[PDB]
């Protein structure tokens, strides 16, 4: 029922999954054709990478960074990551502080990896499902 990439997905199914990912991860802000990561898209469509690896790619791109990172304090960036990548809001200040320090020490890419590498993300979306806003956890 959530936007998924089942095996033997058709070429249409991939385009649809790709749109879902752009919508989710770039926070429902439709992006110009020039902003698309066609190389990445193409690889997903071939079966070389999974939905999850595609999500990670978009979240670490200049496209995401320009929209959410460069013109925000990290505390707001973290909120946005939770929303885009985990489909929810932080439960606590603790959760933010954690990512705050991870970003301070390990940098932005590593922080992004952390949301997507989480057990929470594995259990909810795994390799083939596009993160969606869970109104209930
Ligand atoms: Cl690309």
Short mmCIF file of N, CA and C and ligand atoms in Angstrom, two decimals:
data_model
loop_
_atom_site.label_atom_id
_atom_site.label_comp_id
_atom_site.label_asym_id
_atom_site.label_seq_id
_atom_site.Cartn_x
_atom_site.Cartn_y
_atom_site.Cartn_z
N UNK A 1 0.78 -1.24 0.00
CA UNK A 1 0.00 0.00 0.00
C UNK A 1 0.82 1.31 0.00
N UNK A 2 1.84 1.44 0.88
CA UNK A 2 2.84 2.51 0.74
C UNK A 2 3.68 2.34 -0.53
N UNK A 3 4.20 3.44 -1.07
CA UNK A 3 4.87 3.40 -2.36
C UNK A 3 6.11 2.52 -2.33
N UNK A 4 6.05 1.44 -3.09
CA UNK A 4 7.03 0.39 -2.95
C UNK A 4 7.62 0.04 -4.31
N UNK A 5 8.74 -0.66 -4.30
CA UNK A 5 9.30 -1.21 -5.52
C UNK A 5 9.34 -2.73 -5.38
N UNK A 6 8.28 -3.39 -5.84
CA UNK A 6 8.24 -4.84 -5.80
C UNK A 6 9.15 -5.40 -6.90
N UNK A 7 9.59 -6.66 -6.75
CA UNK A 7 10.42 -7.22 -7.82
C UNK A 7 9.62 -7.41 -9.12
N UNK A 8 10.30 -7.24 -10.25
CA UNK A 8 9.66 -7.26 -11.56
C UNK A 8 8.76 -6.04 -11.69
N UNK A 9 9.20 -4.95 -11.07
CA UNK A 9 8.56 -3.66 -11.25
C UNK A 9 8.70 -3.27 -12.71
N UNK A 10 7.67 -2.64 -13.25
CA UNK A 10 7.70 -2.20 -14.63
C UNK A 10 8.36 -0.84 -14.68
N UNK A 11 8.66 -0.38 -15.89
CA UNK A 11 9.36 0.88 -16.06
C UNK A 11 8.50 2.02 -15.55
N UNK A 12 7.19 1.89 -15.71
CA UNK A 12 6.28 2.86 -15.14
C UNK A 12 6.38 2.89 -13.60
N UNK A 13 6.42 1.71 -12.98
CA UNK A 13 6.50 1.60 -11.52
C UNK A 13 7.69 2.37 -10.93
N UNK A 14 8.82 2.33 -11.63
CA UNK A 14 10.02 3.04 -11.20
C UNK A 14 9.83 4.56 -11.27
N UNK A 15 9.27 5.05 -12.37
CA UNK A 15 9.07 6.48 -12.55
C UNK A 15 8.17 6.99 -11.43
N UNK A 16 7.15 6.20 -11.13
CA UNK A 16 6.24 6.54 -10.06
C UNK A 16 6.95 6.54 -8.69
N UNK A 17 7.75 5.51 -8.41
CA UNK A 17 8.49 5.48 -7.16
C UNK A 17 9.43 6.66 -7.08
N UNK A 18 10.09 6.97 -8.19
CA UNK A 18 10.98 8.12 -8.23
C UNK A 18 10.26 9.44 -7.90
N UNK A 19 9.09 9.66 -8.50
CA UNK A 19 8.31 10.87 -8.19
C UNK A 19 7.98 10.92 -6.70
N UNK A 20 7.52 9.79 -6.15
CA UNK A 20 7.19 9.71 -4.72
C UNK A 20 8.35 10.12 -3.83
N UNK A 21 9.55 9.70 -4.20
CA UNK A 21 10.76 9.99 -3.44
C UNK A 21 11.10 11.48 -3.51
N UNK A 22 10.98 12.06 -4.70
CA UNK A 22 11.25 13.49 -4.84
C UNK A 22 10.29 14.31 -3.98
N UNK A 23 9.01 14.00 -4.08
CA UNK A 23 7.93 14.61 -3.29
C UNK A 23 8.18 14.50 -1.77
N UNK A 24 8.58 13.32 -1.32
CA UNK A 24 8.76 13.06 0.10
C UNK A 24 10.01 13.72 0.64
N UNK A 25 11.10 13.57 -0.09
CA UNK A 25 12.40 13.95 0.42
C UNK A 25 12.71 15.42 0.20
N UNK A 26 12.15 16.00 -0.85
CA UNK A 26 12.31 17.43 -1.07
C UNK A 26 11.09 18.20 -0.55
N UNK A 27 10.31 17.51 0.28
CA UNK A 27 9.25 18.11 1.06
C UNK A 27 8.13 18.69 0.23
N UNK A 28 7.72 17.95 -0.79
CA UNK A 28 6.65 18.38 -1.69
C UNK A 28 6.91 19.75 -2.29
N UNK A 29 8.01 19.85 -3.01
CA UNK A 29 8.37 21.07 -3.69
C UNK A 29 8.80 20.59 -5.04
N UNK A 30 7.92 20.69 -6.03
CA UNK A 30 8.26 20.09 -7.32
C UNK A 30 9.43 20.82 -7.97
N UNK A 31 10.41 20.01 -8.36
CA UNK A 31 11.69 20.49 -8.85
C UNK A 31 11.76 20.43 -10.37
N UNK A 32 12.48 21.37 -10.97
CA UNK A 32 12.60 21.45 -12.42
C UNK A 32 13.27 20.20 -12.97
N UNK A 33 13.06 19.96 -14.25
CA UNK A 33 13.65 18.81 -14.90
C UNK A 33 15.17 18.83 -14.80
N UNK A 34 15.77 20.02 -14.73
CA UNK A 34 17.23 20.13 -14.66
C UNK A 34 17.82 19.74 -13.30
N UNK A 35 16.96 19.77 -12.28
CA UNK A 35 17.37 19.45 -10.91
C UNK A 35 17.36 17.94 -10.63
N UNK A 36 16.62 17.19 -11.45
CA UNK A 36 16.57 15.74 -11.30
C UNK A 36 17.94 15.09 -11.37
N UNK A 37 18.09 13.98 -10.66
CA UNK A 37 19.34 13.23 -10.66
C UNK A 37 19.14 12.03 -11.58
N UNK A 38 19.13 12.30 -12.88
CA UNK A 38 18.75 11.29 -13.85
C UNK A 38 19.67 10.07 -13.75
N UNK A 39 20.97 10.31 -13.60
CA UNK A 39 21.93 9.24 -13.39
C UNK A 39 21.49 8.31 -12.26
N UNK A 40 21.22 8.89 -11.10
CA UNK A 40 20.68 8.15 -9.97
C UNK A 40 19.37 7.46 -10.35
N UNK A 41 18.43 8.22 -10.92
CA UNK A 41 17.14 7.65 -11.35
C UNK A 41 17.33 6.42 -12.22
N UNK A 42 18.27 6.55 -13.15
CA UNK A 42 18.47 5.57 -14.19
C UNK A 42 18.93 4.29 -13.52
N UNK A 43 19.87 4.44 -12.60
CA UNK A 43 20.38 3.32 -11.82
C UNK A 43 19.30 2.60 -11.01
N UNK A 44 18.35 3.36 -10.48
CA UNK A 44 17.26 2.75 -9.72
C UNK A 44 16.43 1.90 -10.67
N UNK A 45 16.10 2.50 -11.81
CA UNK A 45 15.30 1.87 -12.86
C UNK A 45 15.92 0.58 -13.42
N UNK A 46 17.25 0.53 -13.44
CA UNK A 46 17.97 -0.66 -13.90
C UNK A 46 17.93 -1.79 -12.87
N UNK A 47 17.95 -1.43 -11.60
CA UNK A 47 17.92 -2.44 -10.56
C UNK A 47 19.29 -2.53 -9.92
N UNK A 48 20.12 -1.54 -10.22
CA UNK A 48 21.47 -1.45 -9.66
C UNK A 48 21.46 -0.97 -8.20
N UNK A 49 20.55 -0.04 -7.90
CA UNK A 49 20.33 0.43 -6.53
C UNK A 49 18.88 0.27 -6.08
N UNK A 50 18.70 0.24 -4.76
CA UNK A 50 17.40 0.12 -4.13
C UNK A 50 16.73 1.49 -3.91
N UNK A 51 15.44 1.47 -3.61
CA UNK A 51 14.75 2.70 -3.25
C UNK A 51 15.51 3.42 -2.14
N UNK A 52 15.85 2.67 -1.10
CA UNK A 52 16.53 3.24 0.05
C UNK A 52 17.83 3.94 -0.34
N UNK A 53 18.63 3.32 -1.19
CA UNK A 53 19.88 3.96 -1.63
C UNK A 53 19.59 5.17 -2.50
N UNK A 54 18.47 5.14 -3.21
CA UNK A 54 18.07 6.31 -3.97
C UNK A 54 17.67 7.47 -3.05
N UNK A 55 16.94 7.16 -1.98
CA UNK A 55 16.52 8.17 -1.00
C UNK A 55 17.75 8.84 -0.38
N UNK A 56 18.68 8.01 0.07
CA UNK A 56 19.92 8.49 0.64
C UNK A 56 20.64 9.43 -0.33
N UNK A 57 20.71 9.04 -1.60
CA UNK A 57 21.34 9.88 -2.61
C UNK A 57 20.70 11.25 -2.74
N UNK A 58 19.38 11.29 -2.83
CA UNK A 58 18.68 12.56 -2.94
C UNK A 58 18.90 13.42 -1.70
N UNK A 59 18.88 12.78 -0.53
CA UNK A 59 19.01 13.50 0.74
C UNK A 59 20.40 14.08 0.94
N UNK A 60 21.39 13.50 0.28
CA UNK A 60 22.77 13.98 0.37
C UNK A 60 23.18 14.88 -0.79
N UNK A 61 22.26 15.14 -1.71
CA UNK A 61 22.58 15.92 -2.90
C UNK A 61 22.63 17.41 -2.63
N UNK A 62 23.26 18.14 -3.54
CA UNK A 62 23.29 19.60 -3.50
C UNK A 62 21.88 20.17 -3.55
N UNK A 63 20.97 19.39 -4.10
CA UNK A 63 19.59 19.82 -4.28
C UNK A 63 18.88 19.95 -2.93
N UNK A 64 19.10 18.96 -2.07
CA UNK A 64 18.59 18.92 -0.71
C UNK A 64 19.31 19.96 0.13
N UNK A 65 20.63 20.00 -0.02
CA UNK A 65 21.45 20.89 0.78
C UNK A 65 21.10 22.34 0.50
N UNK A 66 20.87 22.67 -0.77
CA UNK A 66 20.54 24.04 -1.13
C UNK A 66 19.20 24.45 -0.55
N UNK A 67 18.26 23.51 -0.52
CA UNK A 67 16.90 23.79 -0.06
C UNK A 67 16.74 23.84 1.46
N UNK A 68 17.51 23.03 2.18
CA UNK A 68 17.27 22.83 3.62
C UNK A 68 18.43 23.10 4.57
N UNK A 69 19.67 23.05 4.07
CA UNK A 69 20.86 23.10 4.94
C UNK A 69 21.59 24.45 5.02
N UNK A 70 21.81 25.07 3.87
CA UNK A 70 22.70 26.22 3.80
C UNK A 70 22.05 27.44 4.42
N UNK A 71 20.73 27.49 4.34
CA UNK A 71 19.96 28.61 4.87
C UNK A 71 19.09 28.24 6.06
N UNK A 72 19.64 27.41 6.95
CA UNK A 72 18.97 27.06 8.18
C UNK A 72 19.99 26.76 9.25
N UNK A 73 19.63 27.04 10.50
CA UNK A 73 20.40 26.54 11.63
C UNK A 73 20.21 25.03 11.72
N UNK A 74 21.22 24.33 12.25
CA UNK A 74 21.24 22.87 12.17
C UNK A 74 20.03 22.24 12.84
N UNK A 75 19.59 22.88 13.91
CA UNK A 75 18.41 22.45 14.66
C UNK A 75 17.16 22.36 13.78
N UNK A 76 17.00 23.32 12.88
CA UNK A 76 15.92 23.24 11.94
C UNK A 76 16.20 22.15 10.88
N UNK A 77 17.44 22.07 10.40
CA UNK A 77 17.80 21.02 9.44
C UNK A 77 17.43 19.63 9.97
N UNK A 78 17.79 19.37 11.22
CA UNK A 78 17.48 18.09 11.86
C UNK A 78 15.99 17.78 11.86
N UNK A 79 15.18 18.75 12.29
CA UNK A 79 13.72 18.60 12.20
C UNK A 79 13.31 18.16 10.80
N UNK A 80 13.79 18.89 9.80
CA UNK A 80 13.48 18.60 8.42
C UNK A 80 13.90 17.19 8.00
N UNK A 81 15.09 16.76 8.45
CA UNK A 81 15.55 15.40 8.18
C UNK A 81 14.57 14.38 8.76
N UNK A 82 14.19 14.56 10.02
CA UNK A 82 13.23 13.68 10.65
C UNK A 82 11.95 13.58 9.82
N UNK A 83 11.44 14.72 9.39
CA UNK A 83 10.22 14.76 8.59
C UNK A 83 10.39 14.07 7.21
N UNK A 84 11.42 14.44 6.46
CA UNK A 84 11.65 13.88 5.13
C UNK A 84 12.05 12.41 5.17
N UNK A 85 12.99 12.08 6.05
CA UNK A 85 13.59 10.74 6.03
C UNK A 85 12.92 9.73 6.95
N UNK A 86 12.38 10.20 8.07
CA UNK A 86 11.70 9.29 8.98
C UNK A 86 10.18 9.44 9.02
N UNK A 87 9.66 10.47 8.36
CA UNK A 87 8.22 10.67 8.27
C UNK A 87 7.57 11.10 9.57
N UNK A 88 8.36 11.69 10.48
CA UNK A 88 7.82 12.17 11.75
C UNK A 88 8.59 13.36 12.32
N UNK A 89 8.17 13.81 13.49
CA UNK A 89 8.87 14.88 14.17
C UNK A 89 9.72 14.24 15.25
N UNK A 90 10.76 14.94 15.70
CA UNK A 90 11.53 14.44 16.85
C UNK A 90 10.61 14.28 18.05
N UNK A 91 10.78 13.23 18.84
CA UNK A 91 10.01 13.04 20.06
C UNK A 91 10.54 13.94 21.15
N UNK A 92 11.84 14.20 21.11
CA UNK A 92 12.46 14.89 22.22
C UNK A 92 13.66 15.73 21.83
N UNK A 93 14.03 16.65 22.73
CA UNK A 93 15.24 17.45 22.60
C UNK A 93 16.46 16.54 22.50
N UNK A 94 16.42 15.42 23.24
CA UNK A 94 17.50 14.43 23.23
C UNK A 94 17.85 13.99 21.82
N UNK A 95 16.82 13.66 21.04
CA UNK A 95 17.01 13.17 19.69
C UNK A 95 17.72 14.22 18.83
N UNK A 96 17.34 15.48 19.01
CA UNK A 96 17.95 16.58 18.27
C UNK A 96 19.41 16.78 18.69
N UNK A 97 19.66 16.81 19.99
CA UNK A 97 21.01 16.97 20.50
C UNK A 97 21.92 15.91 19.91
N UNK A 98 21.44 14.67 19.89
CA UNK A 98 22.22 13.59 19.29
C UNK A 98 22.68 13.94 17.87
N UNK A 99 21.73 14.28 17.01
CA UNK A 99 22.07 14.57 15.61
C UNK A 99 22.89 15.85 15.50
N UNK A 100 22.57 16.83 16.33
CA UNK A 100 23.38 18.04 16.44
C UNK A 100 24.88 17.68 16.60
N UNK A 101 25.21 16.84 17.57
CA UNK A 101 26.61 16.50 17.80
C UNK A 101 27.18 15.63 16.69
N UNK A 102 26.37 14.74 16.15
CA UNK A 102 26.82 13.86 15.08
C UNK A 102 27.23 14.74 13.91
N UNK A 103 26.40 15.73 13.60
CA UNK A 103 26.69 16.65 12.51
C UNK A 103 27.94 17.47 12.82
N UNK A 104 28.09 17.89 14.08
CA UNK A 104 29.25 18.68 14.49
C UNK A 104 30.53 17.89 14.28
N UNK A 105 30.51 16.63 14.69
CA UNK A 105 31.71 15.80 14.69
C UNK A 105 31.99 15.10 13.38
N UNK A 106 30.95 14.51 12.80
CA UNK A 106 31.12 13.65 11.63
C UNK A 106 30.71 14.30 10.29
N UNK A 107 30.01 15.44 10.35
CA UNK A 107 29.59 16.15 9.16
C UNK A 107 28.21 15.78 8.64
N UNK A 108 27.75 16.53 7.65
CA UNK A 108 26.39 16.40 7.12
C UNK A 108 26.07 15.04 6.47
N UNK A 109 26.96 14.55 5.62
CA UNK A 109 26.70 13.25 4.98
C UNK A 109 26.49 12.16 6.02
N UNK A 110 27.36 12.12 7.02
CA UNK A 110 27.27 11.09 8.05
C UNK A 110 25.96 11.19 8.86
N UNK A 111 25.56 12.42 9.19
CA UNK A 111 24.28 12.62 9.83
C UNK A 111 23.15 12.04 8.98
N UNK A 112 23.07 12.45 7.71
CA UNK A 112 22.07 11.89 6.79
C UNK A 112 22.05 10.36 6.83
N UNK A 113 23.22 9.74 6.67
CA UNK A 113 23.31 8.29 6.83
C UNK A 113 22.65 7.79 8.11
N UNK A 114 22.71 8.59 9.17
CA UNK A 114 22.24 8.08 10.46
C UNK A 114 20.72 7.86 10.47
N UNK A 115 19.95 8.75 9.84
CA UNK A 115 18.49 8.60 9.83
C UNK A 115 18.11 7.33 9.06
N UNK A 116 18.75 7.19 7.91
CA UNK A 116 18.46 6.12 6.97
C UNK A 116 19.01 4.76 7.44
N UNK A 117 20.12 4.78 8.18
CA UNK A 117 20.70 3.55 8.74
C UNK A 117 20.02 3.08 10.03
N UNK A 118 19.13 3.90 10.56
CA UNK A 118 18.51 3.60 11.84
C UNK A 118 17.65 2.34 11.76
N UNK A 119 17.54 1.64 12.89
CA UNK A 119 16.60 0.54 13.04
C UNK A 119 15.18 1.00 12.74
N UNK A 120 14.82 2.18 13.25
CA UNK A 120 13.53 2.78 12.94
C UNK A 120 13.26 2.80 11.43
N UNK A 121 14.23 3.27 10.65
CA UNK A 121 14.07 3.35 9.20
C UNK A 121 14.00 1.95 8.57
N UNK A 122 14.81 1.03 9.07
CA UNK A 122 14.81 -0.33 8.57
C UNK A 122 13.43 -0.96 8.74
N UNK A 123 12.86 -0.81 9.93
CA UNK A 123 11.60 -1.46 10.28
C UNK A 123 10.44 -0.85 9.54
N UNK A 124 10.49 0.47 9.35
CA UNK A 124 9.38 1.16 8.72
C UNK A 124 9.38 1.10 7.20
N UNK A 125 10.54 1.35 6.59
CA UNK A 125 10.60 1.43 5.13
C UNK A 125 11.54 0.39 4.49
N UNK A 126 12.62 0.04 5.17
CA UNK A 126 13.55 -0.93 4.61
C UNK A 126 14.13 -0.52 3.26
N UNK A 127 14.49 -1.51 2.44
CA UNK A 127 15.19 -1.24 1.18
C UNK A 127 14.31 -0.71 0.03
N UNK A 128 13.01 -1.01 0.05
CA UNK A 128 12.19 -0.74 -1.12
C UNK A 128 10.98 0.15 -0.95
N UNK A 129 10.80 0.75 0.22
CA UNK A 129 9.61 1.58 0.44
C UNK A 129 9.97 3.05 0.65
N UNK A 130 9.17 3.92 0.06
CA UNK A 130 9.46 5.34 0.13
C UNK A 130 8.92 5.88 1.45
N UNK A 131 9.79 6.51 2.26
CA UNK A 131 9.37 7.11 3.54
C UNK A 131 8.12 7.92 3.34
N UNK A 132 7.16 7.76 4.24
CA UNK A 132 5.92 8.53 4.22
C UNK A 132 5.68 9.09 5.61
N UNK A 133 4.93 10.18 5.73
CA UNK A 133 4.69 10.73 7.05
C UNK A 133 3.79 9.80 7.87
N UNK A 134 4.35 9.20 8.91
CA UNK A 134 3.59 8.32 9.78
C UNK A 134 2.97 9.22 10.82
N UNK A 135 1.64 9.26 10.87
CA UNK A 135 0.99 10.10 11.86
C UNK A 135 0.88 9.37 13.22
N UNK A 136 1.36 8.13 13.24
CA UNK A 136 1.24 7.26 14.40
C UNK A 136 2.42 6.27 14.42
N UNK A 137 3.13 6.19 15.54
CA UNK A 137 4.32 5.34 15.62
C UNK A 137 4.29 4.29 16.76
CL1 LIG B 1 22.54 11.84 -11.23
#
